[PDB]
Design an enzyme around this catalytic site. Structure first.
Site, PDB file in Angstrom:
ATOM      1  CG  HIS A  87      -2.166  -0.967   0.913  1.00 55.58           C
ATOM      2  ND1 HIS A  87      -2.246  -2.195   1.526  1.00 55.58           N
ATOM      3  CD2 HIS A  87      -3.266  -0.868   0.120  1.00 55.58           C
ATOM      4  CE1 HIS A  87      -3.337  -2.822   1.116  1.00 55.58           C
ATOM      5  NE2 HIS A  87      -3.973  -2.039   0.256  1.00 55.58           N
ATOM      6  CG  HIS A  91      -1.845   0.320  -4.392  1.00 49.65           C
ATOM      7  ND1 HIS A  91      -2.548  -0.607  -5.138  1.00 49.65           N
ATOM      8  CD2 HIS A  91      -2.761   0.959  -3.634  1.00 49.65           C
ATOM      9  CE1 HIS A  91      -3.830  -0.524  -4.852  1.00 49.65           C
ATOM     10  NE2 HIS A  91      -3.985   0.420  -3.938  1.00 49.65           N
ATOM     11  CG  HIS A 127      -6.951   5.062  -3.580  1.00 47.06           C
ATOM     12  ND1 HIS A 127      -5.926   4.989  -4.501  1.00 47.06           N
ATOM     13  CD2 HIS A 127      -7.121   3.810  -3.103  1.00 47.06           C
ATOM     14  CE1 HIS A 127      -5.507   3.739  -4.583  1.00 47.06           C
ATOM     15  NE2 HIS A 127      -6.213   3.011  -3.738  1.00 47.06           N
ATOM     16  CG  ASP A 128      -4.886   2.836  -0.480  1.00 51.93           C
ATOM     17  OD1 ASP A 128      -5.827   2.755   0.321  1.00 51.93           O
ATOM     18  OD2 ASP A 128      -4.681   1.972  -1.368  1.00 51.93           O
ATOM     19  CG  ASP A 240      -8.298  -0.206  -4.291  1.00 51.36           C
ATOM     20  OD1 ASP A 240      -7.071   0.034  -4.287  1.00 51.36           O
ATOM     21  OD2 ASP A 240      -8.976  -0.299  -3.247  1.00 51.36           O
TER      22      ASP A 240
HETATM   23  C1  LIG Z   1      -4.095  -9.875  -5.699  1.00 55.57           C
HETATM   24  O1  LIG Z   1      -4.391 -10.230  -4.352  1.00 55.57           O
HETATM   25  C2  LIG Z   1      -5.200  -9.420  -3.596  1.00 55.57           C
HETATM   26  C3  LIG Z   1      -5.590  -8.139  -3.966  1.00 55.57           C
HETATM   27  C4  LIG Z   1      -6.403  -7.404  -3.124  1.00 55.57           C
HETATM   28  C5  LIG Z   1      -6.825  -7.933  -1.907  1.00 55.57           C
HETATM   29  C6  LIG Z   1      -7.718  -7.144  -1.024  1.00 55.57           C
HETATM   30  N1  LIG Z   1      -8.513  -7.825  -0.277  1.00 55.57           N
HETATM   31  N2  LIG Z   1      -9.366  -7.152   0.558  1.00 55.57           N
HETATM   32  C7  LIG Z   1     -10.517  -7.956   1.045  1.00 55.57           C
HETATM   33  C8  LIG Z   1     -11.257  -8.573  -0.122  1.00 55.57           C
HETATM   34  C9  LIG Z   1     -10.055  -8.999   2.039  1.00 55.57           C
HETATM   35  C10 LIG Z   1      -9.170  -5.825   0.943  1.00 55.57           C
HETATM   36  O2  LIG Z   1      -9.929  -5.269   1.725  1.00 55.57           O
HETATM   37  C11 LIG Z   1      -7.950  -5.124   0.379  1.00 55.57           C
HETATM   38  C12 LIG Z   1      -7.973  -3.590   0.462  1.00 55.57           C
HETATM   39  C13 LIG Z   1      -8.713  -2.955  -0.666  1.00 55.57           C
HETATM   40  C14 LIG Z   1      -9.077  -3.605  -1.751  1.00 55.57           C
HETATM   41  C15 LIG Z   1      -8.737  -5.033  -2.011  1.00 55.57           C
HETATM   42  C16 LIG Z   1      -7.675  -5.626  -1.054  1.00 55.57           C
HETATM   43  C17 LIG Z   1      -6.434  -9.219  -1.528  1.00 55.57           C
HETATM   44  C18 LIG Z   1      -5.650  -9.983  -2.383  1.00 55.57           C
HETATM   45  C19 LIG Z   1      -5.159 -11.239  -1.989  1.00 55.57           C
HETATM   46  C20 LIG Z   1      -4.042 -11.284  -1.162  1.00 55.57           C
HETATM   47  C21 LIG Z   1      -3.440 -12.483  -0.834  1.00 55.57           C
HETATM   48  C22 LIG Z   1      -3.944 -13.684  -1.322  1.00 55.57           C
HETATM   49  C23 LIG Z   1      -3.251 -14.981  -1.032  1.00 55.57           C
HETATM   50  O3  LIG Z   1      -3.007 -15.745  -1.971  1.00 55.57           O
HETATM   51  N3  LIG Z   1      -2.774 -15.240   0.197  1.00 55.57           N
HETATM   52  C24 LIG Z   1      -2.774 -14.375   1.391  1.00 55.57           C
HETATM   53  C25 LIG Z   1      -2.200 -15.266   2.478  1.00 55.57           C
HETATM   54  C26 LIG Z   1      -2.482 -16.671   1.977  1.00 55.57           C
HETATM   55  O4  LIG Z   1      -3.862 -16.990   2.111  1.00 55.57           O
HETATM   56  C27 LIG Z   1      -2.121 -16.523   0.509  1.00 55.57           C
HETATM   57  C28 LIG Z   1      -5.037 -13.645  -2.183  1.00 55.57           C
HETATM   58  C29 LIG Z   1      -5.628 -12.438  -2.523  1.00 55.57           C
HETATM   59 MG   LIG Z   2      -7.597   1.523   0.489  1.00 58.14          MG
HETATM   60 ZN   LIG Z   3      -5.887   0.937  -2.769  1.00 59.99          ZN
END
Ligand SMILES: COc1ccc(C2=NN(C(C)C)C(=O)[C@@H]3CC=CC[C@H]23)cc1-c1ccc(C(=O)N2CC[C@@H](O)C2)cc1
Ligand SMILES: [Mg+2]
Ligand SMILES: [Zn+2]
Length: 335
Positions: A87, A91, A127-128, A240
């Site tokens: 972040h 980004h 925005h962040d 985002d």
């Molecule tokens: C490209 O990957 C991502 C992009 C945005 C997010 C987000 N999730 N989220 C929620 C949907 C939980 C947010 O609030 C973040 C802040 C604002 C917007 C989207 C952001 C999460 C992942 C995400 C992160 C990690 C994994 C993953 O593979 N992990 C994380 C740890 C283990 O489980 C392996 C998967 C998706």
């Molecule tokens: Mg944000």
């Molecule tokens: Zn953002």
């Protein structure tokens, strides 16, 4: 809502000397990771990308924002991002570049006014602001001082209200006020829409923003102002969560970075006595593939396909690329 230290001549010159030959910042295949690796001052190259994108659009020129005020604004934003894994300033420059492609390669500019397009590209960069790599749930669950203030104050969007406060602070200096050329009612719309869009990026509101957008798109002429407002919210949200719409290698590099922030939040929660959800727990996971597939299936694929089919037809490539990336992760799992 008050002054910041002035941007200097030398800081501005360090951005203006960056050349970027063999990059096209308007292309859907633009690679910010390669741009960062091409030079020993990646923060100056990132600022130059934002500057060339905004000036190339013609929008600051239309709305009374000089080259110097635009560059000052970009540099005041940069100063307020932290050294965090995901972040960070990279980004937000990525979100700005991506939104430009949705507007002008995806033709979403047809749904919005020129002023709304200008406000969107500016809002991407704020925005962040000052994100500490911790989500709203962290502050509330651990009784961190900002969580106590949200609990006492009413609003649970701890992060997003903070980002808005700092945007207002930067725009309070005439030397970095990109909306100073706007008159009366227009200046008010610009601030209201910037704040609305930032507040709409809290993923706790993901479902309700999507449903309000789809309802407003169902009959646009019944309430045009509502459709415009929601289209701005949905495009910032789309930028985002756009990492999964990029070429695979770029997508994978973003996934590595955000994953590390998730794990660090889990570590800090465990240390403060709270029992952590397994997605955030280093000891409960191995490779990236399964998590990217889950993110695609439960969040990103239905979001992008629903907004495309509802009215954003020119953004079809996003759905195609999400499906291609998912197949690549699935092959990793199957082997
Ligand atoms: C490209 O990957 C991502 C992009 C945005 C997010 C987000 N999730 N989220 C929620 C949907 C939980 C947010 O609030 C973040 C802040 C604002 C917007 C989207 C952001 C999460 C992942 C995400 C992160 C990690 C994994 C993953 O593979 N992990 C994380 C740890 C283990 O489980 C392996 C998967 C998706
Ligand atoms: Mg944000
Ligand atoms: Zn953002």
């Amino acid at each position: 809502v008050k002054r910041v230290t002035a941007i200097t001549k030398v800081e501005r010159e360090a951005v203006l000397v960056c050349e970027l030959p063999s990059f096209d910042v308007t292309d859907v295949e633009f690679d910010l990771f390669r741009a960062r690796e091409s030079t020993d001052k990646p923060l100056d190259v990132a600022a130059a990308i934002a500057y060339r994108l905004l000036l190339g659009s013609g929008l600051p020129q239309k709305f009374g924002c000089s080259d110097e005020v635009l560059l000052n604004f970009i540099l005041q934003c940069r100063k307020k991002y932290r050294n965090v894994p995901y972040h960070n300033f990279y980004h937000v420059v990525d979100v700005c570049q991506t939104i430009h492609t949705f507007l002008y390669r995806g033709n979403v500019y047809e749904k919005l006014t020129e002023l709304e397009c200008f406000v969107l590209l500016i809002t991407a960069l704020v925005h962040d602001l000052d994100h500490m790599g911790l989500n709203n749930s962290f502050y509330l669950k651990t009784e961190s001082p900002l969580g106590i203030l949200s609990s006492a104050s009413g609003n649970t969007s701890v992060l997003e209200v903070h980002h808005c406060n700092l945007a207002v602070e930067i725009l309070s200096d005439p030397e970095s006020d990109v909306f100073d050329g706007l008159e009366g009612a227009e200046r008010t719309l610009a601030f209201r829409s910037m704040i609305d869009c930032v507040l709409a990026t809290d993923m706790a509101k993901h479902g309700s923003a999507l449903e309000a957008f789809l309802a407003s798109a169902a009959d646009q002429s019944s309430d045009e102002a509502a459709f415009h407002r929601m289209t701005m919210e949905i495009i910032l949200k789309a930028g985002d969560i756009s990492n999964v719409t990029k070429p695979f290698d770029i997508s994978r590099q973003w996934a590595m970075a955000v994953t590390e922030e998730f794990y660090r939040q889990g570590d800090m929660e465990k240390e403060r006595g709270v029992e952590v959800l397994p997605m955030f727990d280093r000891s409960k996971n191995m490779e990236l593939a399964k998590g990217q597939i889950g993110f695609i299936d439960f969040v990103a694929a239905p979001f992008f396909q629903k907004i495309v089919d509802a009215c954003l037809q020119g953004m079809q490539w996003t759905v195609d690329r999400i499906k291609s990336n998912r197949a690549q992760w699935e092959r990793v799992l199957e082997t």
